[PDB]
Enzyme design. Sequence first.
Site, mmCIF file in Angstrom:
data_model
loop_
_atom_site.group_PDB
_atom_site.id
_atom_site.type_symbol
_atom_site.label_atom_id
_atom_site.label_comp_id
_atom_site.label_asym_id
_atom_site.label_seq_id
_atom_site.Cartn_x
_atom_site.Cartn_y
_atom_site.Cartn_z
ATOM 1 N N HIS A 1 0.823 -1.191 0.000
ATOM 2 C CA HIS A 1 0.000 0.000 0.000
ATOM 3 C C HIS A 1 0.859 1.243 0.000
ATOM 4 C CE1 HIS A 1 1.017 -0.876 4.226
ATOM 5 N NE2 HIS A 1 1.139 0.439 4.320
ATOM 6 N N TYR B 1 -3.227 3.720 2.318
ATOM 7 C CA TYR B 1 -4.368 3.476 1.419
ATOM 8 C C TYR B 1 -3.967 2.461 0.374
ATOM 9 C CZ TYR B 1 -6.469 7.469 3.561
ATOM 10 O OH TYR B 1 -6.988 8.300 4.520
HETATM 11 C C1 FAD Z 1 -3.067 -1.508 4.540
HETATM 12 C C2 FAD Z 1 -4.183 -0.510 4.703
HETATM 13 C C3 FAD Z 1 -4.866 -0.043 3.555
HETATM 14 C C4 FAD Z 1 -5.935 0.907 3.651
HETATM 15 N N1 FAD Z 1 -6.655 1.303 2.528
HETATM 16 C C5 FAD Z 1 -7.718 2.178 2.611
HETATM 17 C C6 FAD Z 1 -8.592 2.589 1.491
HETATM 18 O O1 FAD Z 1 -8.487 2.217 0.353
HETATM 19 N N2 FAD Z 1 -9.608 3.493 1.696
HETATM 20 C C7 FAD Z 1 -9.861 4.074 2.979
HETATM 21 O O2 FAD Z 1 -10.744 4.879 3.053
HETATM 22 N N3 FAD Z 1 -9.136 3.659 4.024
HETATM 23 C C8 FAD Z 1 -8.105 2.749 3.920
HETATM 24 N N4 FAD Z 1 -7.368 2.345 5.002
HETATM 25 C C9 FAD Z 1 -7.609 2.844 6.382
HETATM 26 C C10 FAD Z 1 -7.674 4.367 6.483
HETATM 27 O O3 FAD Z 1 -6.367 4.910 6.161
HETATM 28 C C11 FAD Z 1 -7.985 4.954 7.834
HETATM 29 O O4 FAD Z 1 -8.974 4.273 8.608
HETATM 30 C C12 FAD Z 1 -8.612 6.284 7.390
HETATM 31 O O5 FAD Z 1 -8.261 7.179 6.333
HETATM 32 C C13 FAD Z 1 -8.733 6.968 8.716
HETATM 33 O O6 FAD Z 1 -8.229 8.425 8.672
HETATM 34 P P1 FAD Z 1 -8.769 9.716 9.086
HETATM 35 O O7 FAD Z 1 -7.463 10.515 9.079
HETATM 36 O O8 FAD Z 1 -9.767 10.117 8.179
HETATM 37 O O9 FAD Z 1 -9.245 9.531 10.487
HETATM 38 P P2 FAD Z 1 -8.576 9.550 11.993
HETATM 39 O O10 FAD Z 1 -8.611 10.869 12.235
HETATM 40 O O11 FAD Z 1 -7.526 8.500 11.854
HETATM 41 O O12 FAD Z 1 -9.487 8.565 12.627
HETATM 42 C C14 FAD Z 1 -10.805 8.749 13.203
HETATM 43 C C15 FAD Z 1 -11.039 7.591 14.270
HETATM 44 O O13 FAD Z 1 -12.361 7.880 14.909
HETATM 45 C C16 FAD Z 1 -13.478 7.157 14.310
HETATM 46 N N5 FAD Z 1 -14.381 8.170 13.708
HETATM 47 C C17 FAD Z 1 -14.086 9.534 13.528
HETATM 48 N N6 FAD Z 1 -15.145 10.053 12.958
HETATM 49 C C18 FAD Z 1 -16.117 9.239 12.720
HETATM 50 C C19 FAD Z 1 -17.434 9.378 12.085
HETATM 51 N N7 FAD Z 1 -17.923 10.471 11.570
HETATM 52 N N8 FAD Z 1 -18.190 8.227 12.033
HETATM 53 C C20 FAD Z 1 -17.711 7.036 12.551
HETATM 54 N N9 FAD Z 1 -16.491 6.825 13.138
HETATM 55 C C21 FAD Z 1 -15.681 7.955 13.211
HETATM 56 C C22 FAD Z 1 -12.834 6.134 13.414
HETATM 57 O O14 FAD Z 1 -13.394 4.876 13.693
HETATM 58 C C23 FAD Z 1 -11.327 6.104 13.837
HETATM 59 O O15 FAD Z 1 -11.082 5.203 14.900
HETATM 60 C C24 FAD Z 1 -6.266 1.397 4.976
HETATM 61 C C25 FAD Z 1 -5.575 0.919 6.138
HETATM 62 C C26 FAD Z 1 -4.549 -0.027 6.031
HETATM 63 C C27 FAD Z 1 -3.940 -0.420 7.358
#
Ligand code: FAD
Length: 272
Positions: A49, A65
């Site tokens: 990734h 991602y």
């Molecule tokens: C190998 C790998 C590949 C991945 N590929 C992808 C992909 O293709 N597409 C993708 O989207 N992600 C993918 N992810 C995961 C993704 O990167 C993260 O979960 C995501 O982008 C979280 O980032 P954030 O910065 O938006 O949120 P942060 O700020 O990291 O996280 C918010 C945290 O609070 C919760 N949360 C916050 N707001 C809300 C809300 N409104 N409703 C419900 N729960 C909430 C979430 O559950 C999480 O625990 C991948 C992860 C791994 C490990």
Amino acid sequence: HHHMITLENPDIKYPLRLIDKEILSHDTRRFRFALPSPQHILGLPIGQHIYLSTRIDGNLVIRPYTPVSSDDDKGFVDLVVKVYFKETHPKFPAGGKMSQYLENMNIGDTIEFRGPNGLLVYQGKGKFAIRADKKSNPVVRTVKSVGMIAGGTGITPMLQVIRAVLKDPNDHTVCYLLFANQSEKDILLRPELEELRNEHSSRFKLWYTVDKAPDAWDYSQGFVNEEMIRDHLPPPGEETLILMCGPPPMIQFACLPNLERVGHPKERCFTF
Ligand SMILES: Cc1cc2nc3c(=O)[nH]c(=O)nc-3n(C[C@H](O)[C@H](O)[C@H](O)COP(=O)(O)OP(=O)(O)OC[C@H]3O[C@@H](n4cnc5c(N)ncnc54)[C@H](O)[C@@H]3O)c2cc1C
Ligand SMILES: NC(=O)c1ccc[n+]([C@@H]2O[C@@H](COP(=O)([O-])OP(=O)(O)OC[C@H]3O[C@@H](n4cnc5c(N)ncnc54)[C@H](O)[C@@H]3O)[C@H](O)[C@@H]2O)c1
């Protein structure tokens, strides 16, 4: 490097331009960025990734991602992302950082890409090159069946593997997917997964489970459990490898103990 790829050095940051966006649903999107030239490819080995990174609210934010596009695509890279909107979930008033930053970008803006990264690389024809950790060389193994457990966005790392297997008419590996989500509306990429089930039934088994089940539902309800593992993932054996990607609480409490009970040893379980 054999091909003109974008990710030449994993320690480098590459700023890509956002050229297109699609609204799949209220909170899911497709983001498309331009590669350095229309003739480039991303250069992401299967099983690996990338990470996006940028500065949000004064801090550096990094997130992994797995693109839905592949190295067969020239000039662009596609990401399918779930947007976590602020002031929506009572427990997380602030929402997601990288997902909302993505949702707020204007076409033409850029964001940094880096990769490839990941301890697991699929070399095709059932062969998996795995590193115990980053400082070791990979140990190669050949399997016949790949069980896959995905929760929420953990599905993209499985879809990348699944498509690699199916595109090779000579790859005889059979993939078993058990896809878990909060509700039916939250089943990310259902059309793409079902199209694949349609065309390659013999090499792709598909099953779903949702926390809240609608009245018309032909699949499972509830967190992944012992019964689901037995019924929808291949049985234990050297010929079987189990792949996992989803929320920490899912892997720690619903997958491992049950995979252990069923007989899938840790050396045959990999967590993306
Ligand atoms: C190998 C790998 C590949 C991945 N590929 C992808 C992909 O293709 N597409 C993708 O989207 N992600 C993918 N992810 C995961 C993704 O990167 C993260 O979960 C995501 O982008 C979280 O980032 P954030 O910065 O938006 O949120 P942060 O700020 O990291 O996280 C918010 C945290 O609070 C919760 N949360 C916050 N707001 C809300 C809300 N409104 N409703 C419900 N729960 C909430 C979430 O559950 C999480 O625990 C991948 C992860 C791994 C490990
Ligand atoms: N494994 C990790 O260390 C780690 C770290 C950061 C982020 N993530 C993220 O987790 C995946 C989460 O996606 P999401 O937030 O949209 O998922 P989600 O919250 O919408 O759904 C999670 C699914 O996992 C299961 N699950 C969730 N909480 C559980 C619990 N307490 N016990 C048992 N099962 C539980 C349920 O079946 C549920 O439908 C992302 O793709 C990414 O991998 C994982």
